[PDB]
Amino acid sequence: MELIRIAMKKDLENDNSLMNKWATVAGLKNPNPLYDFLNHDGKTFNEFSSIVNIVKSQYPDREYELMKDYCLNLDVKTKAARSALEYADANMFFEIEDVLIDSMISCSNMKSKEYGKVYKIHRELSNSVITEFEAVKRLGKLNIKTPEMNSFSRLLLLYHYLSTGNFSPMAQLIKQIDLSEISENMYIRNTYQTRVHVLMSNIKLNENSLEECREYSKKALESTNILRFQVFSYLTIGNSLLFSNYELAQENFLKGLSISVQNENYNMIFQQALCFLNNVWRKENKWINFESDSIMDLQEQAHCFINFNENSKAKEVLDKLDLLVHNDNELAMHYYLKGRLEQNKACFYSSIEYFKKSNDKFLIRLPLLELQKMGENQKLLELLLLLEYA
């Protein structure tokens, strides 16, 4: 038996009313499938939603430990194992997901094989093990048949564009996703829908289309019970408030911090967000990570030092950054910081260049402001604001 099955059976002997309870939490609407699941090995709910909602309602503090068990004990050729693959990737449970994936690409179900290979391409692109060209080529050679992997093959490209700072392709691509074509796996369709909400929130943020951003993050939160999507919803709301409402932005970052207490990845993410917030508002910054050589963290140190006219320290940090390789992502902020330290307009023109190149219409308000403060001609500021990059 499965740890989940063991625990449910134990807890049943002491509380019978759980059955009508669990059945309602699982959507079932008469407990026969619950009974069947508990009493017969290898039995499966029609939708992965059922066992997930049960585990979240009855054993939240154990969700990982149990589901890692359950997922890894599934027949890989089933609909439940494909649903479990998406469950793993969505929660960023990369152990469950990666093992599932190597079991799925070798197996004898065509659908599970296709899922495994596409999600494999997503994981390889995520870790910069293959190029985007190689990802597209591989996806093309798969002759994807299912609507689910038709949608996800576009989704993984969206994630890659988001994390590499290549925002201009995102809008046209996300419009191509059509989730109404998913009819066989409602768990996958609903989770993909949440993904689309968060991604559209991000696209709206990067277009400086801010009310929209927050609305789509609202929809994402209402549509999910997955911690990852809640985390990035609060991150995006708070970030959309970066230039306008200090307390509400910090409030969303602190909410996200509070729901991801034990998870160090999310913790680092919200700490970096609060650090950037305090640097934008030129306040004292207790969120700076002084024991890091990541480009983000060093940039935020330099930003703070620049804010408080600690020019020797800022110059030391920028030397550190000079000895590191930047992607086009990081370069705009690099030139913004150099421009502020050196009192230099040309640097702000370079920063604007790279914000345009990445099609980032949100953060580009930082260099523009500086040019405005330095007395830049108003019509010229309009021009720089409205032209864009090929």
Add this chain to the structure above:
Amino acid sequence: MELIRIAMKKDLENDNSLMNKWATVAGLKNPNPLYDFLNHDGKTFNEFSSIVNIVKSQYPDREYELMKDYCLNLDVKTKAARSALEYADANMFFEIEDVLIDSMISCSNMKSKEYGKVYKIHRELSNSVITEFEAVKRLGKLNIKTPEMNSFSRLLLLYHYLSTGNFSPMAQLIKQIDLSEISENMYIRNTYQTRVHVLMSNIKLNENSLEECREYSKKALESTNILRFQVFSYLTIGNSLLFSNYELAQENFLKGLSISVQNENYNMIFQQALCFLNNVWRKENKWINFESDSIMDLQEQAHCFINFNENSKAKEVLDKLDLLVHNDNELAMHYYLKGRLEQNKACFYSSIEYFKKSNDKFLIRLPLLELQKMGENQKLLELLLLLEYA
């Protein structure tokens, strides 16, 4: 008998060797079709090229008078009348063309009707009688069947984009034209081919892609015996030399002048080209038309006055221009002239704005230069040079 036929017979009585001559000039391969044409009323050559080349070889000085007769005597349902519609439009013989068109939209031949209606939409758009939106709607409602009008419906849009200063759609649109699909009318295919040569020459000019421009105009000249296409080929070559080679630009404009002696439109066109050339090079300008209220001519008056620091006179002309309506190209040039008169950077930024909006990467060298003379930061100039309008 047609005037053409009358003259051909008259000259035949006096010179027999003309048969083998005309037959070779008409492409024929033997005089059998020539004799058929002369002996049977209303009989047509398989290609309209034949009578055109004959008239050009034997009665050049009369080409219009004869062909107007011939074209207006044609059975409108025939291939020769469709070929003659393209002949009239290509030579800008608006009398022949408009009469042909009203006769062809009324007839019972579906091909001739379609030609007539599409060319009608072209002439109405040319004369600003309908908007581009209305042209597109009417073209769509025509359910075009023939390849010829598939190509020409795009060609007329290209002409409208060129003459309104909306250059950015032109490249993608011209790439959609596929003349190899025209198999029934070789006169129309070859004349369209010349049209595409001239248009691509212009698109390359507007992209500041100059050697390419001259190559396509070179091809246009080699592909034609039609005066209108030679005129605009020489106009475009000379224009491509505007900022580099004064003598060769003037040479091409004077050539165009010399081959279009009696035609007042072409004469005005080359005089305006020479006027602009001399203003770009800040020379004495005998080519200015002081008896005009068109935007071009007034702008060149102001340009000359500004060149020679006659600021009161330039201000007077620019007052006149202020009381007139401009398109985006002409507005970019307006802000260039204002920028030079007032020595004002913001005006040059507006000029850049409208050159970008029209996707004119050639004339935009005028305001940029001035900004450079006023000491504009080079990195900023790089930025303005590389960013574009949405």
